[PDB]
Design an enzyme around this catalytic site. Sequence first.
Site, mmCIF file in Angstrom:
data_model
loop_
_atom_site.group_PDB
_atom_site.id
_atom_site.type_symbol
_atom_site.label_atom_id
_atom_site.label_comp_id
_atom_site.label_asym_id
_atom_site.label_seq_id
_atom_site.Cartn_x
_atom_site.Cartn_y
_atom_site.Cartn_z
ATOM 1 N N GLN A 11 25.701 -59.441 23.941
ATOM 2 C CA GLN A 11 27.004 -60.094 23.900
ATOM 3 C C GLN A 11 27.228 -60.929 25.153
ATOM 4 O OE1 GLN A 11 30.737 -57.720 23.140
ATOM 5 N NE2 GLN A 11 31.264 -59.767 22.385
ATOM 6 N N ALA A 12 26.842 -60.395 26.313
ATOM 7 C CA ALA A 12 26.922 -61.178 27.541
ATOM 8 C C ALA A 12 26.023 -62.404 27.468
ATOM 9 C CB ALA A 12 26.553 -60.309 28.743
ATOM 10 N N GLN A 15 27.648 -65.018 25.093
ATOM 11 C CA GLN A 15 28.865 -65.545 25.701
ATOM 12 C C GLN A 15 28.553 -66.367 26.946
ATOM 13 O OE1 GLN A 15 31.044 -61.876 26.135
ATOM 14 N NE2 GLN A 15 32.041 -62.095 24.139
ATOM 15 N N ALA A 90 22.618 -51.519 18.885
ATOM 16 C CA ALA A 90 21.968 -50.357 19.477
ATOM 17 C C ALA A 90 22.945 -49.289 19.948
ATOM 18 C CB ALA A 90 21.085 -50.793 20.649
ATOM 19 N N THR A 136 21.163 -53.553 23.541
ATOM 20 C CA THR A 136 20.251 -54.641 23.210
ATOM 21 C C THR A 136 19.781 -55.363 24.465
ATOM 22 O OG1 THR A 136 21.374 -54.914 21.084
ATOM 23 C CG2 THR A 136 19.957 -56.714 21.829
ATOM 24 N N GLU A 174 26.031 -45.952 30.922
ATOM 25 C CA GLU A 174 25.555 -47.070 31.736
ATOM 26 C C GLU A 174 24.464 -46.691 32.732
ATOM 27 O OE1 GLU A 174 28.817 -49.124 33.533
ATOM 28 O OE2 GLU A 174 27.645 -50.947 33.868
ATOM 29 N N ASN A 197 30.247 -57.644 37.842
ATOM 30 C CA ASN A 197 31.545 -58.099 37.362
ATOM 31 C C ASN A 197 32.641 -57.846 38.388
ATOM 32 O OD1 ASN A 197 30.835 -59.277 34.969
ATOM 33 N ND2 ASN A 197 31.309 -57.494 33.690
ATOM 34 N N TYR A 215 36.626 -62.826 30.526
ATOM 35 C CA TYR A 215 35.186 -63.038 30.624
ATOM 36 C C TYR A 215 34.830 -64.513 30.509
ATOM 37 C CZ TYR A 215 33.976 -58.065 30.477
ATOM 38 O OH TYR A 215 33.824 -56.732 30.778
ATOM 39 N N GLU A 245 7.997 -73.403 43.265
ATOM 40 C CA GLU A 245 8.320 -73.305 44.684
ATOM 41 C C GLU A 245 9.255 -72.135 44.948
ATOM 42 O OE1 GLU A 245 9.320 -77.021 46.530
ATOM 43 O OE2 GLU A 245 8.906 -78.175 44.708
HETATM 44 N N1 LIG Z 1 30.038 -61.067 33.087
HETATM 45 C C1 LIG Z 1 30.124 -60.808 31.788
HETATM 46 N N2 LIG Z 1 29.673 -59.601 31.298
HETATM 47 C C2 LIG Z 1 29.757 -59.330 29.976
HETATM 48 C C3 LIG Z 1 30.297 -60.261 29.102
HETATM 49 N N3 LIG Z 1 30.259 -59.737 27.859
HETATM 50 C C4 LIG Z 1 29.707 -58.504 27.928
HETATM 51 N N4 LIG Z 1 29.399 -58.235 29.236
HETATM 52 C C5 LIG Z 1 28.776 -57.007 29.762
HETATM 53 O O1 LIG Z 1 28.166 -56.281 28.712
HETATM 54 C C6 LIG Z 1 28.446 -54.903 28.832
HETATM 55 C C7 LIG Z 1 28.504 -54.245 27.458
HETATM 56 O O2 LIG Z 1 27.296 -54.419 26.744
HETATM 57 P P1 LIG Z 1 27.164 -55.577 25.633
HETATM 58 O O3 LIG Z 1 28.064 -56.735 25.983
HETATM 59 O O4 LIG Z 1 27.522 -55.038 24.274
HETATM 60 O O5 LIG Z 1 25.624 -56.044 25.661
HETATM 61 P P2 LIG Z 1 24.515 -55.515 24.615
HETATM 62 O O6 LIG Z 1 23.154 -55.402 25.256
HETATM 63 O O7 LIG Z 1 24.467 -56.485 23.462
HETATM 64 O O8 LIG Z 1 25.003 -54.088 24.050
HETATM 65 P P3 LIG Z 1 25.127 -53.819 22.465
HETATM 66 O O9 LIG Z 1 26.344 -54.526 21.924
HETATM 67 O O10 LIG Z 1 25.253 -52.337 22.211
HETATM 68 O O11 LIG Z 1 23.898 -54.337 21.762
HETATM 69 C C8 LIG Z 1 29.771 -54.818 29.570
HETATM 70 O O12 LIG Z 1 29.778 -53.730 30.463
HETATM 71 C C9 LIG Z 1 29.853 -56.110 30.350
HETATM 72 O O13 LIG Z 1 29.587 -55.845 31.705
HETATM 73 C C10 LIG Z 1 30.752 -61.478 29.589
HETATM 74 O O14 LIG Z 1 31.234 -62.315 28.828
HETATM 75 N N5 LIG Z 1 30.663 -61.746 30.934
HETATM 76 N N1 LIG Z 2 10.293 -87.607 56.634
HETATM 77 C C1 LIG Z 2 10.262 -87.275 55.321
HETATM 78 N N2 LIG Z 2 9.856 -86.028 54.979
HETATM 79 C C2 LIG Z 2 9.808 -85.649 53.683
HETATM 80 C C3 LIG Z 2 10.204 -86.608 52.647
HETATM 81 N N3 LIG Z 2 10.064 -85.980 51.467
HETATM 82 C C4 LIG Z 2 9.615 -84.725 51.725
HETATM 83 N N4 LIG Z 2 9.464 -84.532 53.048
HETATM 84 C C5 LIG Z 2 8.999 -83.296 53.721
HETATM 85 O O1 LIG Z 2 7.896 -82.682 53.055
HETATM 86 C C6 LIG Z 2 7.925 -81.284 53.345
HETATM 87 C C7 LIG Z 2 7.415 -80.492 52.152
HETATM 88 O O2 LIG Z 2 7.310 -81.363 51.031
HETATM 89 P P1 LIG Z 2 6.730 -80.805 49.643
HETATM 90 O O3 LIG Z 2 7.720 -81.017 48.525
HETATM 91 O O4 LIG Z 2 6.377 -79.344 49.761
HETATM 92 O O5 LIG Z 2 5.449 -81.749 49.416
HETATM 93 P P2 LIG Z 2 4.055 -81.187 48.849
HETATM 94 O O6 LIG Z 2 3.042 -81.161 49.970
HETATM 95 O O7 LIG Z 2 3.567 -82.113 47.766
HETATM 96 O O8 LIG Z 2 4.220 -79.801 48.280
HETATM 97 C C8 LIG Z 2 9.370 -80.938 53.663
HETATM 98 O O9 LIG Z 2 9.446 -80.311 54.944
HETATM 99 C C9 LIG Z 2 10.104 -82.259 53.717
HETATM 100 O O10 LIG Z 2 10.877 -82.350 54.914
HETATM 101 C C10 LIG Z 2 10.636 -87.948 53.098
HETATM 102 O O11 LIG Z 2 10.990 -88.826 52.282
HETATM 103 N N5 LIG Z 2 10.635 -88.194 54.413
HETATM 104 MG MG LIG Z 3 24.584 -56.536 21.435
#
Ligand SMILES: Nc1nc2c(ncn2[C@@H]2O[C@H](COP(=O)(O)OP(=O)(O)OP(=O)(O)O)[C@@H](O)[C@H]2O)c(=O)[nH]1
Ligand SMILES: Nc1nc2c(ncn2[C@@H]2O[C@H](COP(=O)(O)OP(=O)(O)O)[C@@H](O)[C@H]2O)c(=O)[nH]1
Ligand SMILES: [Mg+2]
Lengths: 430, 427, 427, 49
Positions: A11-12, A15, A90, A136, A174, A197, A215, A245
Amino acid sequence: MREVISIHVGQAGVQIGNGCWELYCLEHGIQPDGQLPDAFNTFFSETGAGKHVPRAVFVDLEPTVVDEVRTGTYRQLFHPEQLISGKEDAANNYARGHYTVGKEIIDLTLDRIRKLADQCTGLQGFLIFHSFGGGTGAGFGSLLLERLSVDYGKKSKLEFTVYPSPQVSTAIVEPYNSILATHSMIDHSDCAFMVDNEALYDLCRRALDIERPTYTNLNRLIGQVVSSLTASLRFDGALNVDFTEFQTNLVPYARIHFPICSYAPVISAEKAYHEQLSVAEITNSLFEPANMMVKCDPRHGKYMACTLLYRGDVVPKDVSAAVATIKTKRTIQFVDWCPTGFKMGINYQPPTVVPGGDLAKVQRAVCMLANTTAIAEAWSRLDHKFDLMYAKRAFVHWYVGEGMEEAEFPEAREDLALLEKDYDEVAAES
Amino acid sequence: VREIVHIQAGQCGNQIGAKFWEVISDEHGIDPTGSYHGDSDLQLERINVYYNEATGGKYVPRAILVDLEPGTMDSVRAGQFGQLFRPDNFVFGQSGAGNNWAKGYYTEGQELCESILDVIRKEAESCDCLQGFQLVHSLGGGTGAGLGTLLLNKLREEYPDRILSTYSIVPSPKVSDTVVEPYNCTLSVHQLVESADEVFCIDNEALYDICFRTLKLTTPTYGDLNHLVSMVMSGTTCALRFPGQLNSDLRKLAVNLVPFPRLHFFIVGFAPLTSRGSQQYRALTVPELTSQLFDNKNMMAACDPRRGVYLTASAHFRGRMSSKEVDEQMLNIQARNTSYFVEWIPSNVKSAICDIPPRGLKMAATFIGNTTAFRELFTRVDSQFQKMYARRAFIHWYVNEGLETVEFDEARSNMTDLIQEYEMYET
Amino acid sequence: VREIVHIQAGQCGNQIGAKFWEVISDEHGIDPTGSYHGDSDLQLERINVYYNEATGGKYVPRAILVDLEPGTMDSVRAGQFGQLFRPDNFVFGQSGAGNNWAKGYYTEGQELCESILDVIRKEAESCDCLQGFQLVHSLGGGTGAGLGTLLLNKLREEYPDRILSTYSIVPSPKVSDTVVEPYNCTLSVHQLVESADEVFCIDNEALYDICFRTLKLTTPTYGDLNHLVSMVMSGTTCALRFPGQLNSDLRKLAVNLVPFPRLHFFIVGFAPLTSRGSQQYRALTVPELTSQLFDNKNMMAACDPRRGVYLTASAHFRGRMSSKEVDEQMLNIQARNTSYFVEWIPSNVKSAICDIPPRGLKMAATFIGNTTAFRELFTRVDSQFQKMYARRAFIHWYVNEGLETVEFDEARSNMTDLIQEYEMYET
Amino acid sequence: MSRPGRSLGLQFLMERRAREEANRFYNEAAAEDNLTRQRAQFEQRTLNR
Ligand SMILES: Nc1nc2c(ncn2[C@@H]2O[C@H](COP(=O)(O)OP(=O)(O)OP(=O)(O)O)[C@@H](O)[C@H]2O)c(=O)[nH]1
Ligand SMILES: Nc1nc2c(ncn2[C@@H]2O[C@H](COP(=O)(O)OP(=O)(O)O)[C@@H](O)[C@H]2O)c(=O)[nH]1
Ligand SMILES: [Mg+2]
Ligand SMILES: Nc1nc2c(ncn2[C@@H]2O[C@H](COP(=O)(O)OP(=O)(O)O)[C@@H](O)[C@H]2O)c(=O)[nH]1
């Protein structure tokens, strides 16, 4: 050109699915019928004419939550085969959702996800959403990842799950489902995020100004975080961050992977006009315990790695100065064998707002995903709660009757103790 | 007829390459569509060094773009100069970069190696002569550090005589873009020491300082930061493309500045740099140029020379100027600061003059120097690597690719000995 | 080639200096945009004295501007000829315009001085020659008085040979504005007496007496009062800038006027001055100029020369005139008024002639003299400081920045002997 | 041995002060860039414009 596939469980998951894709279509500009009034192909496929289709699959073991999508406004955008629904849920039982009912529908879904993978020439990664307390989400979610692990191998399986709150609970069973599902998570998940939550309720009230949320509002906050993470793959930037990365930089150990999430600035549409919100201001706000999406204080522990993602008129020089200023703080602890600790990603697309929304039209924002030892605080609370219930064997009859062998209960408990040892061993210094 | 082939590796390399091709195309006067609408007969004298001609009045650069993921390449296409490049020179993979040196070197590097080499062979064996190759890459990344070094060894095996000049960006000491940099930098330098003839080191922190404190840019984007890198790379090859009073190409530079085969890492710096509002009040002359080059704040690498000593220095001048005035300052800068030069090599400053300056500037100068101050740069990475190497778990990402842990020890030992070698020539 | 470095300090000095550079720029013919647009070749002979050359015909003065906060410079940076000044020559602190002398000297002065000295060294060691410096500052204030004396000491330690000629504004005797003048003036005097070769004291009340009487202006602005000061500063250095019948530079002036190292405080005067309506009818002749200079009312310091006696005096005239006419007035004025001159030095009046007079005036005159009338000025601040130190609560404010109470006694001990020193030489 | 302990912590406080004073000096240069070099030129441009 490069694709990721979204899988939503429970359900979570469904939703949350509406909460995120409402932003994607609005951010990209697609009418909910699929027409237009780019990065389209990262998340959508084209079917001729001008009609697009999201690259996602929704799964649940009961038709109520899915049929809302089928009857909802967005019904025409999604493909009928992607929405998969079982017969009976479940019932918050891991054993029921893993062996008995989970295996009734597992092979139907694995065809649709694999069939969707045919249309991905540049597939790199999956995204999977859970609720730990649900049946579930945990029982069927465990069975889904175990198969996807061997079906595809070295493909990034990123997860974004709702951890049980430190005190707030909606199911008594739980603790049982969370520990059992954790065993499946550690070996198969490449990296799994946490939100809870209880912290979201506090943030949705203090920084964002709403007396009483639902929710739906919480789902929109999560949607912003997923958008910022995927913005590097979709839009141009001076510093892009690919999924592969992000897997290497954050996780220091095989089993320590679990990060935590935060977003800034979060401020009401009324008060957001009041501040310039410079890069230094927003960067400082992330590191406060109050803004954290997981209710654990980082000061109790240390940081192992950090990732900062910027979306706006954000210049490279002032980022480096701001991150330099953070290292000056001596309330932000680091393990001294982690000297660098940061990856910064920069994207140019500013955050996108939603009608009937809850955030403002902010011109620059920052996203943060870091690994900390303070999560061992959260594991300890769950570990103690499980021990009290298992000592008197409070709910064993339900799980064993549904196909689960009782020997799994100490195994999952033992495996969690190893995970707690790993976090404490990493916390050691030389 | 001393053709040079250009290679761009990775996200860092491609964005640097894109701005650099703008600078030369403006210099020769080549339109973004590739046809000449210049203003002088001189610009056609020796354009053959960098451009091939596709009959029809169109010039195609001698460039190869290399990446592991297609994200970087498509940005280049969308640029104003995207259509300039030959389509077949775009060689890319279909896998995540990984930000991992071992995965880049062994997992994806091998597959791309044969495809890229034949593309190079097309450009390498298309010209009457070939002086050397030219690579731009970053050391903190996974593709540029990993796959770039792999191509460098193969280029050496097939073309031993040619000059393998490389431009490198070194990981920053305070705040850096990647966590796994100490592993990527250490393993890459070992490959670079034995293969490349010339290596220039550039740090992003200095560019932030130079643009902000000197050029007075409040918000220096990578466009202007990459712009500074392009001037130095254009200045070095200026002698090949234009006449002058005293010519000096790459091989003269390597002969004079490199006393021993392993001490070849260089610093660079460019002059004049003036605030775009304060440029009017500056009486820019030859002595004014010399002040900026030898000033420590103009070094593009964050390694203060005063903490070390100079071994060799080279200066390039562009524009119509006095030969006596140029020769006098080399005397004076050497005599006034004798504490910063080695006694057992006299005349540590090499000089050269070119006729034709860049646009907007009546005269400009470029500096390349070799000094023992690089021991500061390698100390930071080695100490950081030592902390990381004891935490053995990050190696597991490299073990899952097949890298044996002894390669970490081999890389550090060679790197550690290089620091000691610079120590002894200080005496 | 006798370049003079102009150093400006504080609120008072900046306003005067902006008017001062305005006058010279007009005399040589410098366009406010910085380029020469004058009318004579003779202006370009020795423009090196006060200006530097830029390729493109842009001339920038040798000016250094010092204040504890930008706000005063921002008025000067605005100021009509502001574009002329070099952007980097402006060095200001991060604190307020603290009137406390100890605050300026110790707390904020040390931070500013190190930055100021190297900026001075930029201009000091940039030209072929350097004769002497030129300071315009205040003594009753905190910024000009405190930090100005600090820089003056350090200017002497590095350049002992050069002339430390300064132009100071004196605490008015009847009604000044800053209440703590006795402290600021007394403490500054000890630094001034030993360090500066030549000090010209300027009192506002004398400037407030000539504008009322002679010029007949009901509301002469602060530019007008600083214009009167700017004439004197231009006339003294005019002997260097232009040819003449009898050259007399600063070093000539100090030798003749100063008989003993501590007796060097001077009174200045300028001629001609006439009401702007009656200028047409005045039969301005060389004897007419002599009348104004020796008239007591034209003195720009409120210290009546008739009260004391002259020791030495000097007059500078500008224009093509008769050398006999000038020399005869020095004989006439000296012998007719022997009651105000010492017997033991004959020929107490020095003279000089310059070829080119200023704009608008067919010929102009400047007077510089030394007399025991300065005892009136220092007797004022001496007895007024006496009651200051009997009630020592004011010292706390100076104490808070580390000033000890013995400095007040030491400062009073020095200038009290200075008053006594002028007393004994009257005999 | 806590008074040796502060001696380590105090020296790190001095190190933290000196480490950030270098950046604060660079920040002061940035203030000089904007206020002194640029914004005093802004007043230069102000009365010029
Ligand atoms: N943050 C958040 N938590 C949710 C929401 N809806 C349900 N939950 C969480 O889900 C828990 C209850 O379990 P379910 O929502 O039924 O999830 P499930 O795995 O499908 O359980 P079953 O219905 O028995 O199959 C609650 O304790 C909530 O914490 C939501 O919309 N937002
Ligand atoms: N000076 C400069 N540094 C860059 C630029 N783009 C990326 N870097 C540097 O490149 C480093 C790592 O880049 P990364 O995405 O891992 O490149 P990779 O070697 O292909 O994996 C980072 O510390 C960035 O600061 C740029 O346009 N100018
Ligand atoms: Mg369910
Ligand atoms: N003649 C003259 N006097 C001035 C001017 N500006 C300020 N003063 C006087 O200088 C005295 C001290 O000024 P102050 O602000 O303390 O200058 P500071 O010593 O540099 O700090 C005051 O009594 C003012 O009347 C000016 O432009 N011309």
